[PDB]
Design a protein around this ligand. Structure first.
Ligand SMILES: C[S@@+](CC[C@H](N)C(=O)[O-])C[C@H]1O[C@@H](n2cnc3c(N)ncnc32)[C@H](O)[C@@H]1O
Lengths: 233, 342
């Protein structure tokens, strides 16, 4: 009954025939976009992430709705939760224990906050695919060796980056003399670069504007640093 | 509070002034693994050993530089007039961070090669040894440059001196491992532990070639080794008086040189207070106290030919300076060639 569907679908957001014809192309094809509707936002992103990993259609609604109430309790509701399902569709199909273990690690191993944890979860979905303890060490590297406190660790989306990227760029800056560990109360003699100008930007931009060295020098450094790491560990 | 940390703090203040935008690239290199060259033992099976080093993908940077001597479009003289001969030293390509295996004894029972900062070979090369030369290494231990001087096969006699009896014991170990009991136990080599400052009274006007590779703040080592660090609070007086000691040593080296002979002063510091300033201090001391004229020799062409292998700080008033760079993590190595005219 395409009326019993397209009534609810066209009254809600389906821009063109489009992704509905793609839905036909790909009773579970309606009870799910509702769970997403309640998750919220995503009028066009719902089509975008329906195209990316169509598996959500295969997902049982009992399991999915449980997963939706779960994420909402974590603070992913009101939804968006936008970039999350875009780059980490696995969140709705992966083992629940994964998510809870990450939460139980951020909270109370690394401390932070229910709000801080919800923020990281939304911004750094990578953290769910990453080895626990490797995650802990990465937090520890931020806090103890870089001297970044919790609010900046979340504000800058630090936990999203590989620990290799962090160590490579940070240690390079440190040996260049261009990054100084905050002393006590967090004072450096020279301000330090913005965390985004260290980790967010492309390698070429980082080397051009922050590290201020050639690219070949950094490539050699990466090799030197990797050997140092292998040889102490 | 660690002496290693006082060293870095001291270098940061002085070398960011000396080098400006160039300092970070040097700094990161000082704090990362040094690159090594393998000086082939000419007393071992040098051709065979050279072939094994080549097979590793390393290349003799001396031969490579020398083969380009009359390129650059000019040279003051043929390479053989200007550089000490027969030295083969293999390094991996720029940016290649490979290590050589540790050397082992070969068929003749001597070590096949000697691993060293490739930059250390440059003052020996620049000294310009020629057959029949009477040579003095005034501050010789543990003996890397001493060994290279001997390898040239140009030392009719080599005086190897070092004030420290214990460091001289290391030099003796090296001579025993590298040099057959024939050259080392002959009339050719004399090893002493005398104060180098006294050389003008001991053997004035005697040597054709003198190497003065002085005690200094040894920048790289001082950033890595906490023990007996020159930057310890306990050695501050000693540290600050270094350029006075360095001038006295270079002056002595010059006094020991025949009129017409040549001297290379070297340090492993980036500091102009230990480098150009010492050269200038010794020359002034010799003019004013002894009426002896000393001429700094121009190593520009020499530097240019070796720029394929080393990074240099090109604005050195007198002398030349290899600076650490990640593509070629050699040095620091300051060196200045000069001739005693009178
Ligand atoms: C940089 S090291 C020499 C390195 C050596 N030419 C080599 O290539 O292996 C400087 C040396 O000067 C020695 N020294 C310090 N004061 C001295 C003095 N007054 N006379 C002679 N040697 C001295 C130290 O014992 C030290 O071994």
């Amino acid at each position: 009954x395409x009326x019993x569907x397209x009534x609810x679908x066209x009254x809600x957001x389906x821009x063109x025939x489009x992704x509905x014809x793609x839905x036909x192309x790909x009773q579970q094809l309606l009870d799910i976009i509702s769970e997403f509707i309640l998750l919220g936002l995503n009028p066009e992103p719902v089509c975008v992430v329906l195209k990316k990993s169509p598996q959500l259609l295969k997902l049982p609604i009992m399991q999915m709705r449980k997963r939706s109430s779960y994420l909402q309790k974590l603070g992913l509701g009101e939804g968006k939760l936008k970039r999350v399902l875009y780059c980490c569709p696995e969140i709705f199909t992966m083992r629940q224990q994964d998510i809870n273990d990450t939460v139980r690690l951020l909270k109370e191993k690394c401390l932070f906050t229910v709000q801080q944890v919800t923020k990281i979860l939304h911004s750094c979905p990578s953290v769910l695919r990453e080895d626990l303890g490797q995650l802990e060490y990465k937090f520890q590297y931020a806090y103890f060796r870089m001297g970044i406190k919790h609010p900046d660790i979340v504000k800058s989306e630090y936990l999203q980056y590989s620990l290799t990227k962090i160590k490579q760029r940070h240690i390079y800056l440190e040996r260049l003399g261009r990054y100084q560990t905050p002393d006590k109360k967090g004072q450096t003699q020279i301000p330090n670069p913005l965390l985004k100008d260290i980790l967010r930007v492309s390698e070429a931009e980082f080397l051009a504007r922050t590290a201020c060295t050639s690219v070949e020098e950094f490539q050699v450094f990466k090799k030197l640093l990797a050997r140092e790491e292998e040889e102490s560990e | 509070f660690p002496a290693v940390r006082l060293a870095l703090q001291n270098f940061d203040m002085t070398y960011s002034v000396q080098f400006g935008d160039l300092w970070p690239s040097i700094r990161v290199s000082l704090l990362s693994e040094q690159k090594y060259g393998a000086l082939v033992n000419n007393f071992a099976a040098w051709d065979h050993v050279s072939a094994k080093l080549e097979q590793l993908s390393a290349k003799d940077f001396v031969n490579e530089a020398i083969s380009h001597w009359e390129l650059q479009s000019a040279a003051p003289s043929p390479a053989s007039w200007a550089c000490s001969p027969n030295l083969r030293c293999f390094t991996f390509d720029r940016g290649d961070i490979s290590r050589f295996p540790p050397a082992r004894p070969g068929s003749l029972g001597v070590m096949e090669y000697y691993l060293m900062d490739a930059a250390s070979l440059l003052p020996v090369l620049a000294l310009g040894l020629q057959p029949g030369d009477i040579v003095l290494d005034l501050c010789a231990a543990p003996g890397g440059k001493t060994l290279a001087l001997l390898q040239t096969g140009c030392c009719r006699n080599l005086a190897a001196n070092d004030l420290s009896p214990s460091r001289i014991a290391r030099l003796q170990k090296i001579l025993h491992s590298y040099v057959p009991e024939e050259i080392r136990d002959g009339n050719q080599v004399r090893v002493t532990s005398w104060d180098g400052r006294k050389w003008g009274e001991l053997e004035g006007d005697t040597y054709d070639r003198v190497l003065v590779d002085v005690p200094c703040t040894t920048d790289r080592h001082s950033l890595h080794e906490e023990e007996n660090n020159i930057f310890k609070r306990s050695r501050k007086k000693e540290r600050q008086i270094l350029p006075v000691l360095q001038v006295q040593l270079l002056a002595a080296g010059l006094l020991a040189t025949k009129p017409g002979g040549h001297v290379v002063y070297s340090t492993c510091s980036l500091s102009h207070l230990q480098n150009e300033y010492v050269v200038q201090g010794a020359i002034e001391l010799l003019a004013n106290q002894y009426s002896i004229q000393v001429q700094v020799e121009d190593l520009t062409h020499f530097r240019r030919v070796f720029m394929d292998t080393f990074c240099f700080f090109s604005s050195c008033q007198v002398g030349e300076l290899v600076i650490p760079n990640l593509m070629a993590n050699f040095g620091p190595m300051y060196f200045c060639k000069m001739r005693r005219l009178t």
